[PDB]
Symmetry: C2
Subunit: 313 residues, 2 copies
Amino acid sequence: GFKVAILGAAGGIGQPLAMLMKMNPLVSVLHLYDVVNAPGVTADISHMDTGAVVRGFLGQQQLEAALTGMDLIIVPAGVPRKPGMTRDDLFKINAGIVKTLCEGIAKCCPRAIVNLISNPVNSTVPIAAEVFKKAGTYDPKRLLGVTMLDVVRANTFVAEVLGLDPRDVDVPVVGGHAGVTILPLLSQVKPPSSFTQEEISYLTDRIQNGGTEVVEAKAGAGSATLSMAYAAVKFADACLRGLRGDAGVIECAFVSSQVTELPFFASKVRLGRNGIEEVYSLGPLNEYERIGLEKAKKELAGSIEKGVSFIRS
Amino acid sequence: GFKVAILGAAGGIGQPLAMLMKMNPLVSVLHLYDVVNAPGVTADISHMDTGAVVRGFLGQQQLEAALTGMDLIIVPAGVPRKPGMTRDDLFKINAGIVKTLCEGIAKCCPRAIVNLISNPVNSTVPIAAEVFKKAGTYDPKRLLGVTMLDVVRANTFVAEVLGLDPRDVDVPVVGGHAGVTILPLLSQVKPPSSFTQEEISYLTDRIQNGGTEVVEAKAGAGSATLSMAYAAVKFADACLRGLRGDAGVIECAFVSSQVTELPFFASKVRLGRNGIEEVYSLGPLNEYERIGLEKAKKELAGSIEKGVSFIRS
């Protein structure tokens, strides 16, 4: 099996995520890390009678111990939005957080596959890339922004409109991980289907804003944590199956790419023994998607620069 | 596809338990009930691309809609381990909660299989039984106290000792769900093994105090949530496979039985189309376990009464 580290394992997303990884039969070793409550979460999880052995790590002084030897690093680390946040002062905190964790990764497990969930992903992935570049350990094939939740939402909402089982639907989602930056390619959905103009717009808008659906349901106090955990694990499991050597492991992720003029983009990627084995091109898009693509790119260009800038200064 | 309702889906145990049930293919419909935040959790969960369709229900006024039609009702509901307040006995509270929920269940889904997790199981189950008796819906084959986490811990701890993968270990646990009432039959362990008196001592002690172990670790402000959700789902899933018609579905559970003089006891049971298709006796016990059996029954008798008198008196 493989060794996995979850950074921020005691948070809202972290916990359900650690519970699910502890259940993954491909995980031999599981390191739960956080700046608080790591021991209590570890204790709880240690009782589950599954294959993976779990250990906890608390504080910066233990990050090295948590990271050393890991094959995959799942990073949902990030401070929540509470005191009337979005204050942008938030972004500085999260960017700061992704920064140190990446410094640790660059130092302790430079070859480990990295699944960055820390939001905003459109900026933190570039941040990570820059930090690794500055450390001389950047392998664009091993850094992935987890955009899986958008695909999960798309599959679910598309299935609902088509009256299908969500498990039998696959919706490619490209671009970025926030708002109009999220671009579901309905014209490339599986199984083959046709959508009315009405459905195409309803679906796209819904997928792009699925996040606030949950924030609304929680009176703006919280956001998706469970579905996020479920998605990150579905994605982590994919990376693990890739490291195992499985063929055709394909999923959408926000990665370093040349599929567009932008340095980082979300598209279909093939996961293998050394991370990303192939970044799939966007291919044919219809009018609606083209117009959406451009709007996505415009915002994405700025978000990337924002992250690249945060480090390069 | 089976219909499942989770009472108290917004809590520590409920949320991860709800996420895991959403993932269970045997679940066609999933109802998330609670007095607070049910909508938020539901929205979160509804985005998961799995078969189960999920609906939320908030407050007493919506409990009937949640229950109606359910095949299985998992009940983790109950107040948390408040660190400050040592113990003005949660009993009063939880017991109250259990009673109202059970009244609802007896009225809305009398034929539903029930998985009561509400602490303390040693009392809440007899309470539920007393609530259904008065309602005239009691079916001893349909009420089950979830002691699955005692088995999970045992497998883990025992496998640790044996240096095995907890997945290849089975340790039957009988008796009750608290302290010395939890009785791990180490002599019936699979694979056949031998333990030193020390290990037998350590294992029996640790399994009986598993919960405490976690509370201590979480700095008094919390108890096992994840491992409990994990064990509850494994147990719930067993029931569902039972409802499906599967053969050989055997699990330990605190149920109504005449395995001992007590009206309730945890032992192996076979789950069938109507819930418990048979309650198995304890089998072979060494002197150590027989002694343990006596202490178990001793403290268990009172617990059972403490719960029955909550309804009768």
